[PDB]
Amino acid sequence: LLGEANSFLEVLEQVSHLAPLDKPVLIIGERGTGKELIASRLHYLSSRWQGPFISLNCAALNENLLDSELFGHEAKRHPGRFERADGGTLFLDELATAPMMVQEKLLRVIEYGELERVGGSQPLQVNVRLVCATNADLPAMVNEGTFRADLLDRLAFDVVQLPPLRERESDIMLMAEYFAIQMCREIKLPLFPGFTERARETLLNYRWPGNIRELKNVVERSVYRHGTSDYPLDDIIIDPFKR
C-alpha cells in the first residue's frame, strides 16, 4: 500500500488494532480510496486469515437478487455470501444502497448468528466477521428513514474513515510517480523522465473524484501519450473525452 500522509498512516494503525476483533467494522470513503483493500487487510491481519474473504456490492443487484445472493435460496441449494464466508470475513460494499428489507435481515444475522431457511430445513448458524463500506452519511439517512437506526446502532462498532486523495495531497505525487514508472515498464521506456511543474500543478489542483483508481488511469494514459524518456511529462490528460 502506497502512502505516507499522516491521515493514511493513522488508518493503517487503526486497522492493525481492529483486525483481531470479531466485531463488525464500517469503512467510510469515496470511490477509489482503497476500501476493499482495507477490508482485505482486516481479514489478513485477523485470526480468520486462513478462512475465506468474500465480497459483494449491494448497489449492483436488484432487491430480490441481493436478498438471494446474501442470504441464499431454496427454490439444489444456492448458498448465499454469508454461508460462503463461514469462518471468514464478508465485505459488503455500497451498504447504503441495501433496501430496508435487506437491512432488517442483516441486523438479524448480526444479532442472532443465523440465517432463516424457510421450512423443512433448520436455520443455518453462521460465523462471519463483517466489514462494510459506503460514502453515504448513514446518520443522515437514518434521519431520512432510508437506513435503519437499529442496524447502524449495532453495525458501526467502529468506523474507519479513509481520506480522499485530495486530503492526502502529499501522496498524489508519490503515487503518480509510482504509477508512471510502472507504465514506463509496460511500454518499455528506459526511464520515467519526471513531471514538469505544469503537470504537477494539474495533478495537485484536480480534486480526484475517482481518487486512486482515477489517478492511476490518468497517469498511465498520460505517460503513454507522452511516449518518450527524452523530456519531462508536461501534459496530464485528465479527460480523455475532449481529446
Ligand X SMILES: Nc1ncnc2c1ncn2[C@@H]1O[C@H](COP(=O)(O)OP(=O)(O)NP(=O)(O)O)[C@@H](O)[C@H]1O
93 near ligand X, rule: CB under 6 A = yes
Binding residue for ligand X, selected from 213, 224, 232, 234, defined by CB under 6 A: 213
Binding residue for ligand X, selected from 5, 14, 21, 36, defined by CB under 6 A: 36
33 near ligand X, rule: CB under 6 A = yes
3 near ligand X, rule: CB under 6 A = yes
Q: For residues 51 and 85, give the distance between their C-alpha atoms in angstroms, rounded to a whole number.
A: 8
Binding residue for ligand X, selected from 5, 7, 31, 173, defined by CB under 6 A: 31
Given the complex with ligand X, which of 24 and 29 has the nearer CB atom? 29
3-state SS of the chain is CCCCCHHHHHHHHHHHHHCCCCCCEEEECCCCCCHHHHHHHHHHCCCCCCCCEEEEEHHHCCHHHHHHHHHCECCCCECCHHHHCCCCEEEEECHHHCCHHHHHHHHHHHHHCEECCCCCCCCEECCCEEEEEECCCHHHHHHHCCCCHHHHHHHCCEEEECCCHHHCHHHHHHHHHHHHHHHHHHCCCCCCCCECHHHHHHHHHCCCCCHHHHHHHHHHHHHHHHCCCCCCECCCCCCCCCC
Q: Is 33 annotated as a binding residue?
A: yes
Provide the grid cell at 155: 453495525
Given the complex with ligand X, which of 3 and 193 has the nearer CB atom? 3
148 near ligand X, rule: CB under 6 A = no
132 near ligand X, rule: CB under 6 A = no
166 near ligand X, rule: CB under 6 A = no
60 near ligand X, rule: CB under 6 A = no
Convert 197-209 to b/e letters by CB count within 10 Å (16 or more is b). Answer: eebbebbeebebe
Rounded least distance, CB 57 to ligand X, Å: 7
Q: Which residue is nearest to ligand X (CB)?
A: 34
212 near ligand X, rule: CB under 6 A = yes
215-234 positions binding ligand X, by CB under 6 A: none
Binding residue for ligand X, selected from 25, 35, 71, 193, defined by CB under 6 A: 35
Given the complex with ligand X, which of 72 and 163 has the nearer CB atom? 163
Count the Cβ atoms, other than its own, within 10 Å of residue 63. 12
Q: Is 134 annotated as a binding residue?
A: no
Binding residue for ligand X, selected from 12, 37, 140, 159, defined by CB under 6 A: 37
Size of the site for ligand X (CB under 6 A): 14
Binding positions for ATP are 29-36, 85-94
Which residues of this chain interact with ligand X, rule CB under 6 A? 1-3, 29, 31-37, 93, 212-213
